[PDB]
Amino acid sequence: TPVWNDNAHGVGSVPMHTDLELDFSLTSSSKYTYRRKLTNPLEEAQSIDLHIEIEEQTIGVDVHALGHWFDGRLNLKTSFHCYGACTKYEYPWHTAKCHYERDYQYETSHGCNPSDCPGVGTGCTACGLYLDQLKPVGSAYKIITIRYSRRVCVQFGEENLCKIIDMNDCFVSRHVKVCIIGTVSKFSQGDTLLFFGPGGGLIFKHWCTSTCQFGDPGDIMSPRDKGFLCPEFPGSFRKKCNFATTPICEYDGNMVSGYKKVMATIDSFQSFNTSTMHFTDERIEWKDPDGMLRDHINILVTKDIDFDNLGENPCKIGLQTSSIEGAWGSGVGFTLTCLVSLTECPTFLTSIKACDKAICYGAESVTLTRGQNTVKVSGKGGHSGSTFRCCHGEDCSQIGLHAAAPHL
Amino acid sequence: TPVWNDNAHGVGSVPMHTDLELDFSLTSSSKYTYRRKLTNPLEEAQSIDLHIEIEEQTIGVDVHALGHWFDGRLNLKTSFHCYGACTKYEYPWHTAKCHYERDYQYETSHGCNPSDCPGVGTGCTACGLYLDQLKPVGSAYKIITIRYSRRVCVQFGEENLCKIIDMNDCFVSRHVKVCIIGTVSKFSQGDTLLFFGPGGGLIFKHWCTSTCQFGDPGDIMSPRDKGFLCPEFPGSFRKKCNFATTPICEYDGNMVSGYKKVMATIDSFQSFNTSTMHFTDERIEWKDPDGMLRDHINILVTKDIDFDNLGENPCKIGLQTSSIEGAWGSGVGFTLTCLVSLTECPTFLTSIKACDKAICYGAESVTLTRGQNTVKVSGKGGHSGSTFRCCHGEDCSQIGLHAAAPHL
Amino acid sequence: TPVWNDNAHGVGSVPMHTDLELDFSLTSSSKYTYRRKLTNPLEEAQSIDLHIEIEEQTIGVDVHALGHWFDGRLNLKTSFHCYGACTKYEYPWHTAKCHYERDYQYETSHGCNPSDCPGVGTGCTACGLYLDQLKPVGSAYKIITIRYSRRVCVQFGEENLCKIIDMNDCFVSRHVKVCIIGTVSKFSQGDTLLFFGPGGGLIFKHWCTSTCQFGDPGDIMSPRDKGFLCPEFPGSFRKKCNFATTPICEYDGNMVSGYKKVMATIDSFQSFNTSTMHFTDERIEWKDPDGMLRDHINILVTKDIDFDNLGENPCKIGLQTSSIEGAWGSGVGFTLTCLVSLTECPTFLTSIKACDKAICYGAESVTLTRGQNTVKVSGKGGHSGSTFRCCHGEDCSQIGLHAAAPHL
Numbered sequence A, B, C: 001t002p003v004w005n006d007n008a009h010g011v012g013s014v015p016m017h018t019d020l021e022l023d024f025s026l027t028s029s030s031k032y033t034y035r036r037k038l039t040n041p042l043e044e045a046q047s048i049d050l051h052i053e054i055e056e057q058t059i060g061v062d063v064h065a066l067g068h069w070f071d072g073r074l075n076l077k078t079s080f081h082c083y084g085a086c087t088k089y090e091y092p093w094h095t096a097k098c099h100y101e102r103d104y105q106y107e108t109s110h111g112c113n114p115s116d117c118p119g120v121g122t123g124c125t126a127c128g129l130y131l132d133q134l135k136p137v138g139s140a141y142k143i144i145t146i147r148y149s150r151r152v153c154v155q156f157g158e159e160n161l162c163k164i165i166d167m168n169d170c171f172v173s174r175h176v177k178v179c180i181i182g183t184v185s186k187f188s189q190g191d192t193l194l195f196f197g198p199g200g201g202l203i204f205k206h207w208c209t210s211t212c213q214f215g216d217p218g219d220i221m222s223p224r225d226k227g228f229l230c231p232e233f234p235g236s237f238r239k240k241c242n243f244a245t246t247p248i249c250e251y252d253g254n255m256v257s258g259y260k261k262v263m264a265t266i267d268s269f270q271s272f273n274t275s276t277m278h279f280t281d282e283r284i285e286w287k288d289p290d291g292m293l294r295d296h297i298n299i300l301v302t303k304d305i306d307f308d309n310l311g312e313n314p315c316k317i318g319l320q321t322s323s324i325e326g327a328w329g330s331g332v333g334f335t336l337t338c339l340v341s342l343t344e345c346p347t348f349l350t351s352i353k354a355c356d357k358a359i360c361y362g363a364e365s366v367t368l369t370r371g372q373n374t375v376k377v378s379g380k381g382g383h384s385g386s387t388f389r390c391c392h393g394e395d396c397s398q399i400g401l402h403a404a405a406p407h408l
């Protein structure tokens, strides 16, 4: 009764038949190199070159680009007409993308009309808030997923292999195991990253989403080139009245933009630094130069007898996509349906992944049965050009599918 | 001078006298099985069956059930009377559980009265907001504590032992040690989990607590079957006036429910998936099928000579509860006071726990002295039926105590 | 081609030439002691005393002290004058530190004047909100950085060395390595800690920063002894009018303080406990007595042949500060510029740190070249009396520089 399983990434070893162990805490922002000649314990003349290169920790963040945050000024105007409905007249702020209008229609009165207006219960006083002097101040990105990794290269004799190793995963070969164990608590899913310039940025934990009011972090956004998502103005208008005098609008809510309020208490917010940053559609990768952070590296070497590869198996997998639902750029995510054929084993416990161009976006552990299988993989991230493929290890299907856009 | 201590869960070993080590990164949502015949290095005919089963990672979340979130419609009504105080008259919205009333009392005026009202400084115009078309949309739970674990079963020869091993704890036996090391950053204390249907849910990081305004996530709640916690309506009423016309109420605040605002930007929020979910009073357990997450497993085996159990000791403990204060279902928590008797040792460094039905809710490290000790254990979680017992290892007192209800 | 690197904290070992390994999960709030006589495998009479003391986990939090949070009562007053501008008259609330005034100037009317006021379009009705019955309820601190550590002391023979070991770092010596691996998810950067009394506190994840409205957690603050940061009052005033009657002000916004609203739902918030707490300027250190938390300890001992110290090198470093910019007590932080001289190596990969009085606030990994180097170190934390020095390992420059104050 075989119960094949390749979800274990690592090795079985006999401590007596192991020749070298390196165990250390490494600065996350530092590389590490190890070179050694493994010579046979005396009683031979055969040496083996061991060369290990571990690269700096990289962070990869799947994001939704939120566009630009703007600074601006809130202006208030008044438009009065003696007679006629409010829609009968066009107002100065009508061209303003972000405006809030309150109408005082059919409400003219003797002690609130100008001298040329004998109207009672007629016409319109229109109050108008609008944003102007708009200026973009930064680009904002919503964090969907966070993963850290190091590229690990191992030469043992003439064998040479490089792999990108995720934090809390292991590099496995016949003679060398490299495991990385770490934790970082700097960034969280749902955080919003703000980049003010063309070095670093700020983390916002409460960027407005379902309610944006003027004054909030993220209050005035342009998701793309043209078109604002305008904030709410929660305050009230008042029509200030006087005899023989044109009505005057007033607004009693907050008048200070979110950018100004944030900049007035900027020390309340967390900055981060970046090095060698790589923006792609809905993804950002960089190396965090924070030298206070460390991760744990263990390297185990057996010179003569091979490690037992704990995921070794004779099972063979064929893959193709069937369908997809859900969205890229979304915290809710997508589901990729894969048709997976298993041969050479009655059952096989493994993981099927949703990947594109060697980036993984989701994975499902599954016990496959001999023959055809239908496997659903939940994923998050990607962009409109992503074709998510069904993958097993380094092997992927011939095509992938596109997910739908978010925020439709 | 003995200084006995059982807070260390693990073993002392001599690397030469160890026979097998398995070290690997395991998919959190996958089980793992290892079977091997340990044969004596040649020069014997005695083999030992080793059988290790590691089950999928389970999450256990102590929660406070918040009841149902509702969608609804905000309606506005007006009730006018020529004469009499506002309390003299009953208003249509008085049966509505969530209503906001503003009275314009003794404020009648010539240009704001109907034709049959010669009142000046009399009567009442009543403005009334109320919620209607209410519908529950989901069940919400406040996270109090999060713990991950795997069930680990080890057979070595005829010895067979199963234990639930918390992440970052170790399974210890005479011949086998299994340590699990991991980190997960998906859920946080204070997060609110929302389940919309009877598969998965959403994480909210800003569900309203001390201030709920209409439009907030969590704005309209029913903590149990009947009875709403109504949201605030922060906007203002206006009495629109006209000659020979009944006053008309207006409200200038947000009119869109929190559910609609959240659903309009649903991609801003994080989903999670679940498998084999088990709801009990104030607790939820499930297996997260997110195959992207991994933890580290180390297994060490000595075939001949026993491990040194680092927590081995001759101390003996008797336990009983004395008192309790504080609350279940609460982020502030409770304190269990235990009377603990130590014999066979002058002192003993150990942990006393507050547990019920093999779930732990709190623990206190303490150096006990020979004879009686009073130990206070801080805990969080549980429900009204919980009887928290004083526990040491797998041993517990004969009865437990109930904590008080939260939110009284 | 030498590529010296001391960023790896750990050892190379030959598993056959290692004599003892202790591997265990330790209660975070517990100490651990190991004592053993290492005797030569028989065939000698030379023993070595091994004595290891591991102290309880300490948390060190760099913070910005926010001052005291206050409870208070919101009061509303009215001041009317028949004639003259509003600034012509002094109002009762003018001495109140937190007050909100709305003026109804030149708006007198027949049906809204007292009997002695024949004014039309004159004088002033002044509405005044003010806070009174103020009382401090707690001291608040903004988390800037969080680090955990254990003090580790190792005696091997006559060698005795104590070091404070950060979580996820290693103690390295010729014969003993001690590595600590752990994760904790209780506190987060940007959390606000509130201490109500002189034992424990509460965690707030949404303490108001860029917008404080009355009713918010953190709404009424005094950053120091005298001087309040007053909250906004987002509601509206109304002037209630009547014939031959003095105008009466009304306010329709929230009237309940943030302290009362939080205390009304206190079970929604997370408490923490403390032991042996040490407040210093902009820093708090304590031992968390939460016995449910554990970390992983590995101890490796070689009795005869020394470990290969993976950071061993012949490079020599001289250090001095050059300049500084940025702020203490700030989530944005500071940058220390150091002049670093490298000799005895063509290049050296290492870390330069910004430290004061054996507390580190920042670190930069850098490949130094022979001769002079300019290295910028990003840091966070400290206080006005901090002199941040350039440091390498345990070696620091002769002076340090002060950063600027935050929130100016």
Ligand SMILES: *[C@@H]1O[C@H](CO[C@H]2O[C@@H](C)[C@@H](O)[C@@H](O)[C@@H]2O)[C@@H](O[C@@H]2O[C@H](CO)[C@@H](O)[C@H](O)[C@H]2NC(C)=O)[C@H](O)[C@H]1NC(C)=O
Binding pocket: A325, A326, A327, A332, A333, A334, A335, A376, A377, A378, B196, B197, B199, B200, B201, B202, B271, B272, B273, B274
């Ligand atoms: C894993 O979760 C997805 C997400 O769908 C869930 O979203 C949550 C926010 C919550 O509302 C929950 O009720 C909801 O099911 C599941 O996929 C969804 O399945 C439904 C039912 O067939 C479809 O109508 C949705 O279009 C579909 N969405 C996506 C993005 O695929 C999924 O079934 C669940 N389980 C697995 C194994 O993936």
Ligand SMILES: *[C@@H]1O[C@H](CO[C@H]2O[C@@H](C)[C@@H](O)[C@@H](O)[C@@H]2O)[C@@H](O[C@@H]2O[C@H](CO)[C@@H](O)[C@H](O)[C@H]2NC(C)=O)[C@H](O)[C@H]1NC(C)=O
Binding pocket: B325, B326, B327, B332, B333, B334, B335, B376, B377, B378, C196, C197, C199, C200, C201, C202, C271, C272, C273, C274
């Ligand atoms: C651990 O903390 C608890 C909780 O009480 C604390 O709650 C914080 C929010 C903060 O306000 C702090 O000042 C407060 O002490 C402590 O228990 C409390 O102790 C007081 C004093 O005797 C009692 O009046 C409370 O009822 C009690 N509450 C509970 C739930 O027990 C506790 O003393 C402290 N220390 C230990 C060792 O548990």
Ligand SMILES: *[C@@H]1O[C@H](CO[C@H]2O[C@@H](C)[C@@H](O)[C@@H](O)[C@@H]2O)[C@@H](O[C@@H]2O[C@H](CO)[C@@H](O)[C@H](O)[C@H]2NC(C)=O)[C@H](O)[C@H]1NC(C)=O
Binding pocket: A196, A197, A199, A200, A201, A202, A271, A272, A273, A274, C325, C326, C327, C332, C333, C334, C335, C376, C377, C378
């Ligand atoms: C690491 O980041 C600091 C912080 O400055 C950054 O702050 C972010 C919030 C964001 O606005 C980003 O654009 C900004 O650069 C950098 O230091 C700053 O550098 C500028 C440019 O010379 C100076 O004007 C600032 O005074 C200075 N601030 C501080 C506190 O030093 C820094 O350059 C960057 N890189 C490194 C290697 O430290």
Ligand code: NA
Binding pocket: A234, A235, A236, B234, B235, B236, C234, C235, C236
């Ligand atoms: Na208002």
